[PDB]
Amino acid sequence: FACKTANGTAIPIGGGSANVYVNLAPVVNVGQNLVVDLSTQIFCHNDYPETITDYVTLQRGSAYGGVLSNFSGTVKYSGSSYPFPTTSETPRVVYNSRTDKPWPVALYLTPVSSAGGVAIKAGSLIAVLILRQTNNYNSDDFQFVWNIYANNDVVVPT
Numbered sequence: 276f277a278c279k280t281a282n283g284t285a286i287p288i289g290g291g292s293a294n295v296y297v298n299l300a301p302v303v304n305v306g307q308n309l310v311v312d313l314s315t316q317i318f319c320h321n322d323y324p325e326t327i328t329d330y331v332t333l334q335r336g337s338a339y340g341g342v343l344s345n346f347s348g349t350v351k352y353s354g355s356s357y358p359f360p361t362t363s364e365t366p367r368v369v370y371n372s373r374t375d376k377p378w379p380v381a382l383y384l385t386p387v388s389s390a391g392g393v394a395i396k397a398g399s400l401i402a403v404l405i406l407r408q409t410n411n412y413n414s415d416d417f418q419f420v421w422n423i424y425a426n427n428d429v430v431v432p433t
């Protein structure tokens with residue numbers, strides 16, 4: 276099992292970490308949702324689908340900076356919703372193909388009532404997503420860290 280970003284930065288067999296830089300809605304109103312969709316940025320595949328089932332959770336979705344102080348957050352994993360920042364590991368998803376498949380992860384962040392001005396600072400770290408990979412074959416328990424970085428400021432109209 277391995278993953279890669281849309282720009283081609285890879286995290287090989289065994290885990291590791293990568294930086295993902297995402298473009299955001301530049302202007303977001305209170306009562307409106309800012310969508311960070313990593314299913315366009317993060318892909319993974321199973322190296323031996325003939326024999327092995329890879330199982331993939333979001334183990335932890337952690338929040339920093341302006342995403343942590345100005346937004347209320349939900350995280351959609353493979354079709355179900357959860358709090359973001361997360362409260363427990365999600366259910367396991369199966370990668371059974373060598374073709375690279377999206378990691379089905381999307382942040383849905385809503386500005387808090389007191390939000391206003393520059394809610395997210397360009398180039399800050401807005402989130403750390405922990406991908407957890409196991410299988411049905413050995414005792415492999417591997418961690419693919421995604422450090423999510425803002426490509427641009429986000430303003431909440433005042």
Ligand SMILES: OC[C@H]1O[C@H](Oc2ccc(-c3ccccc3)cc2)[C@@H](O)[C@@H](O)[C@@H]1O
Pocket residue numbers: 276277288289320321322323324327328329408409410412415417
């Ligand atoms: O995606 C599946 C796995 O691929 C990696 O591990 C192995 C371990 C063993 C074999 C193998 C076994 C017998 C003959 C030829 C190859 C192939 C891959 C490893 O990434 C792991 O976590 C992941 O479950």
